[PDB]
Amino acid sequence: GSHMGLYELSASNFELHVAQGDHFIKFFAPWCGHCKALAPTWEQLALGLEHSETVKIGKVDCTQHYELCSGNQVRGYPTLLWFRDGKKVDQYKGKRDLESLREYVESQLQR
């Protein structure tokens, strides 16, 4: 069940994946109702940014790769984190609609 533009990371590849550039990652659990509610929006976000040279859109299933989650202080879901050049930058707690997410992405790509 893959989606264009949307990376699905694992414990093996997560740190290597976020090492360069900017990343916006959805940490989720399949059981989480708010996560289900957000999933189509996140898929739209990924599709629209599929060809970006500056940001990649990802997700991590914290039921499968929990150490990634606890190691990034993820304690509930969905948690939307920004990474830049291998480091955790922000925990985005703003509005989660597509246009708000796009505006946040653009705000984090001013360098």
* Spans of all domains in the chain: 1-111
User: Which residue, 36, 35, 40, is CA-closest to 6?
Assistant: 40
Architecture of domain 1-111: 3-Layer(aba) Sandwich (3.40)
Q: How far apart are CA 104 and CA 74, in angstroms?
A: 20
Residue 32 bears catalytic tag? yes
Whether 22 and 82 have beta carbons less than 8 Å apart is answered as: yes
Whether 8 and 42 have beta carbons less than 8 Å apart is answered as: no
φ, ψ dihedrals at 72, nearest 5°: -115, 25
Per-residue b or e along 3-16, where b marks 16 or more CB atoms closer than 10 Å to that residue's CB = bebbbebeeeebee
Beta bridge partners of 7: 58
How is residue 111 written in tokens? Answer: 């360098």
* Longest Cα–Cα distance in the chain: 37
Resolution in angstroms for this experimental structure?
0.9
- Catalytic residue from among 3, 21, 32, 55: 32
Indicate which technique resolved this structure: X-ray
- Catalytic residue from among 25, 35, 45, 80: 35
φ, ψ dihedrals at 82, nearest 5°: -100, 135
Q: How far apart are CA 51 and CA 67, in angstroms?
A: 30
